[PDB]
Structures are given as structure tokens and as C-alpha cells.
Design an enzyme around this catalytic site. Structure first.
Site, PDB file in Angstrom:
ATOM      1  N   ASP A 110      -6.899 -11.383 -36.816  1.00 31.13           N
ATOM      2  CA  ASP A 110      -5.677 -11.104 -36.074  1.00 31.13           C
ATOM      3  C   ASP A 110      -4.520 -10.792 -37.033  1.00 31.13           C
ATOM      4  O   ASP A 110      -4.744 -10.207 -38.104  1.00 31.13           O
ATOM      5  CB  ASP A 110      -5.365 -12.310 -35.181  1.00 31.13           C
ATOM      6  CG  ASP A 110      -4.669 -11.926 -33.908  1.00 31.13           C
ATOM      7  OD1 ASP A 110      -3.479 -11.568 -33.981  1.00 31.13           O
ATOM      8  OD2 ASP A 110      -5.307 -11.992 -32.835  1.00 31.13           O
ATOM      9  N   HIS A 169       1.290 -13.452 -32.948  1.00 29.84           N
ATOM     10  CA  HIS A 169       0.135 -13.343 -32.063  1.00 29.84           C
ATOM     11  C   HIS A 169      -1.102 -14.086 -32.602  1.00 29.84           C
ATOM     12  O   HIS A 169      -1.741 -14.853 -31.870  1.00 29.84           O
ATOM     13  CB  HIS A 169      -0.046 -11.875 -31.594  1.00 29.84           C
ATOM     14  CG  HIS A 169      -1.311 -11.190 -32.013  1.00 29.84           C
ATOM     15  ND1 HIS A 169      -2.523 -11.402 -31.389  1.00 29.84           N
ATOM     16  CD2 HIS A 169      -1.522 -10.198 -32.908  1.00 29.84           C
ATOM     17  CE1 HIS A 169      -3.435 -10.608 -31.918  1.00 29.84           C
ATOM     18  NE2 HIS A 169      -2.857  -9.875 -32.851  1.00 29.84           N
ATOM     19  N   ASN A 208      -6.456  -5.363 -21.871  1.00 35.31           N
ATOM     20  CA  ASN A 208      -5.407  -5.574 -20.875  1.00 35.31           C
ATOM     21  C   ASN A 208      -5.040  -4.310 -20.103  1.00 35.31           C
ATOM     22  O   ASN A 208      -3.868  -4.072 -19.819  1.00 35.31           O
ATOM     23  CB  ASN A 208      -4.144  -6.107 -21.550  1.00 35.31           C
ATOM     24  CG  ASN A 208      -4.369  -7.413 -22.286  1.00 35.31           C
ATOM     25  OD1 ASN A 208      -5.329  -8.144 -22.024  1.00 35.31           O
ATOM     26  ND2 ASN A 208      -3.459  -7.727 -23.201  1.00 35.31           N
TER      27      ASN A 208
END
Ligand code: CA
Length: 279
Positions: free
Chosen positions: A39, A69, A161
Site C-alpha cells: 500500500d 491509506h 469501488n
């Protein structure tokens, strides 16, 4: 063990019903397992990690999480308050810059890095990787995820998403890894969550409280948030000896809460991650 006033997602993962607020889990808590968070990095100094987090790799000028994040996701995996597996070891691999972006070539390098790097770590109970990232379909990205899984790592990846079929996204569309959709506190599919045949499991993804940079905390939403619930769950189950890297996605599906989510499109699994812990 019981954690009162836990984030709703933690309570959800140890419950046969929505609407409760205590997280129940075996005290072993993922001790002896490891979870890589691939990440934007992890703020290892955050008190919530208790010295159990460290950066092991970056592809940028710093290993610092200048976004938040990655720190949030790592918190859901293994922070003391916000985490599923409260005693796991967390390893940060910064494949995303501080804007949250990353070239596929760097992301691929990061996956192959983890496959090798686990041989330099102590993880007697097993190894998990959490990939709260993705983009358009790429055979090379899928193949990298498949290699990581094949090497003996439980790979959990975000479905995406886009409120769309995840077949068109990578690494979501890789069959051999565990593709994670998002749900909300009322057991609805999160409105942004991808779906489709390639999904393996759902986890809490809407309004998820976790760690943030600057030693803070934050609630955010995404399949990025659901993924680390599943990664942490895998680590927890591996420490208990209930499953292995090669079988954890299947085991989680086998033991999931079934048929309890709403607005799941025809053809998508109706399975919600569940630890099956009986206090
Ligand atoms: Ca599969």
C-alpha cells in the site's frame, strides 16, 4: 476475549447478527503470523501498533506513509484497538506514492518482493498479504498475485469501488487469490462495492474506523477497508491452526455467514467473513 465498544466491523466479524458492538476473539490474536500490507506504507510509530509494525520496502524516496491509506488498512489488520489480529506482525511494502497511486510495474515488483521476503521473516503460523489497491484488467498483475499466493502467502485483494463486475479489474479478477467485496453495518452490499463471479467473500467496508497518520484515527470507506478484515481474519485463523495460506480463502468462505447480505447481485457470493469464535 471481548473488546467492548469495538468498531462495528470487528463486532460484525465475530457475530451471527448485525447490530452488536463487542468483538470476540481467541486471545492468541494472530501471534506468530505475519501480514504484509502492500500500500502507501505504514506509520510504524503509531502507538496503536505497539512496535509490531515495520516498513520493509519502498520504491519511492521514502518509506513514510504520507497518505494514510496504508496506515488505515494496517490498523484494521492488526492495531490493538482497530485490528482483527491484535498480535500479528505487520510488514509495510510501499508500492503506492503519497497520492495513493502506483504504476503496475512497481506493484508487481512489490508482490514478487513479498514472495521472497517472507523467507527473511519469522512467521511460524503463516503469512498473509493485504492488497487494498487495483486498476483495470492486467494479465501481468493477476499473474503476480497468483505467484505470491502460490509461494505460500494468503493473498487478499480488494474487489474495487466501481459498483461493477470485478472481472474487469486486477488483481481482483485473479481466480487464485481471495477477492473481497464490502458491506455496511446494516448488512447491505456497500453501494460502491464491486461484485461478480470473481468475488470470494465480503467484509465490513463502509464507515470503518482505524489508524491514520500523525498518530491519529479516521473513519473511511472502501473495498480497501474490507480487504484487511479478511487478511487479519486469515492471520488469526492460521495462528489457531484452523487453516493455511493455500486454504484460508476457501475456509473463510466455508465458515462465513451465508445469505445475510442484501443487494447482492444474482451470481455473486452472499458470504460475510466470520471468525466462528465461541467465547
Ligand atoms: Ca478462487
Amino acid at each position: 476475549a471481548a473488546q467492548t465498544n469495538a468498531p462495528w466491523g470487528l463486532a460484525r466479524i465475530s457475530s451471527t447478527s448485525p447490530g452488536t458492538s463487542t468483538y470476540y476473539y481467541d486471545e492468541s490474536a494472530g501471534q506468530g503470523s505475519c501480514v504484509y500490507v502492500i500500500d502507501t506504507g505504514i506509520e510504524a510509530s503509531h502507538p496503536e501498533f505497539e512496535g509490531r509494525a515495520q516498513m520493509v520496502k519502498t520504491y519511492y524516496y521514502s518509506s513514510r506513509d504520507g497518505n494514510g491509506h496504508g496506515t488505515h488498512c494496517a490498523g484494521t489488520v492488526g492495531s490493538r484497538t482497530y485490528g482483527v489480529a491484535k498480535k500479528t506482525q505487520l510488514f509495510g511494502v510501499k508500492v503506492l506514492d503519497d497520492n495513493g497511486s502506483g504504476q503496475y510495474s512497481t506493484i508487481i515488483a512489490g508482490m514478487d518482493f513479498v514472495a521472497s521476503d517472507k523467507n527473511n521473516r519469522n512467521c511460524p503460523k503463516g503469512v498473509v498479504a493485504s492488497l487494498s489497491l487495483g486498476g483495470g484488467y492486467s494479465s501481468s498483475v493477476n499473474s503476480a498475485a497468483a505467484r505470491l499466493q502460490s509461494s505460500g502467502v494468503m493473498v487478499a485483494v480488494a474487489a474495487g469501488n466501481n459498483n461493477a463486475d470485478a472481472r474487469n479489474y486486477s488483481p481482483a479478477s485473479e481466480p487464485s487469490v481471495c477477492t473481497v467485496g464490502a458491506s455496511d453495518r446494516y448488512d447491505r452490499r456497500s453501494s460502491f462495492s464491486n461484485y461478480g463471479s470473481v468475488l470470494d467473500i465480503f467484509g465490513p467496508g463502509t464507515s470503518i474506523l482505524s489508524t491514520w497518520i500523525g498518530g491519529s484515527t479516521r473513519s473511511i470507506s472502501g473495498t480497501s477497508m474490507a480487504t484487511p478484515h479478511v487478511a487479519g481474519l486469515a492471520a488469526y485463523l492460521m495462528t489457531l491452526g484452523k487453516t493455511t495460506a493455500a486454504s484460508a480463502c476457501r475456509y473463510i468462505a466455508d465458515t462465513a455467514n451465508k445469505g445475510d447480505l442484501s443487494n447482492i447481485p444474482f451470481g455473486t457470493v452472499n458470504l460475510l467473513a466470520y471468525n466462528n469464535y465461541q467465547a
